[PDB]
Paper text:
Macrolide resistance is abundant in pathogenic bacteria, and is most often the result of GTP-dependent macrolide kinases (Mph), ribosomal methyltransferases, or efflux pumps. Mph enzymes inactivate macrolides by phosphorylating the 2′-OH of the essential dimethylamino sugar, preventing it from binding the ribosome, and providing the chemical rationale for the resistance phenotype. Mph enzymes are therefore adaptable resistance enzymes with complex evolutionary paths.
In contrast to previous reports, we found that MphB confers resistance to all macrolides tested, and inactivates both telithromycin and azithromycin. Moreover, MphB modifies macrolides with efficiencies comparable to other Mphs (kcat/Km 104–106), and the Km for C3 cladinose macrolides is 19–69× lower than MphI. As we observed in MphH, the NPL, and β-hairpin regions of both MphA and MphB adopt different conformations with macrolide binding.
Author numbering: 2 to 302
The structure:
Amino acid sequence: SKDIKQVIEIAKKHNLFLKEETIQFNESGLDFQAVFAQDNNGIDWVLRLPRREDVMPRTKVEKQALDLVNKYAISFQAPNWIIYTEELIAYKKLDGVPAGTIDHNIGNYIWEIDINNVPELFHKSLGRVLAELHSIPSNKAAALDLVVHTPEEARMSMKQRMDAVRAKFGVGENLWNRWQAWLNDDDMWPKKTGLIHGDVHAGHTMIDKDANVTGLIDWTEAKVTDVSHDFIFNYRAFGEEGLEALILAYKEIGGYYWPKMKEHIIELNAAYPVSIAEFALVSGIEEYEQMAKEALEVQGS
Ligand SMILES: [Ca+2]
Ligand SMILES: [Ca+2]
Ligand SMILES: [Ca+2]
């Protein structure tokens, strides 16, 4: 209605000319509302209409990350914010579809990944993608505002996050002991860091009809750190088998490998309660405070 033209008008002041009749809306989170549309050449676009000021400084890092990945990576797509203003952020839609279920819709047509029948190409192509991504020059990231860890900084970071969560909620004795055993085991910790995506899940992985990964979306957590974060999805969704398949493909295409790689990722998975507790602190939401204490194995009732 009055919204549609408003979009058409905002587009014109940024040199983007749309077909009024193709527009679809999507999630309007705390920060922006999303719009789908075609331009007059038939190309599909994603438009973000901000609904809060500070949209520039909030997105600066993600825009730097997206520009870096676009410059260096050629075996997968990432959003390329070729309109980047206070009024409008817009990019050409990536190829393919997000893996997994397509929620928030009528009908129940597209379902979650079937772990009994994962195509081998899925793990192989994700290993290709992560190996290329993690090889992007960290020196170039360091010239930007991204967080850049050495391997010792990544280890210290985990140590510090664990201490901060313990100070707020406490942590069960056996779990704390397991976390500290991991932190103190030199053989577990990688001796290299690389640029990660930082938010790898099924819904952030774009796939083609053969389940080849063609792109990744949602890059707000990108940083140079322990690459192990980007293997967690495979372990949680596909078990040890899917984790091992991804490690093998990554290792074979030339990604950094170390002998305790798989065991380290599983210990990092066992530190998931740190992240639940961090969200409970940041959000203040009672449900996640409850979830954080059970996951931290604090004796409850
Ligand atoms: Ca490209
Ligand atoms: Ca810097
Ligand atoms: Ca109870």
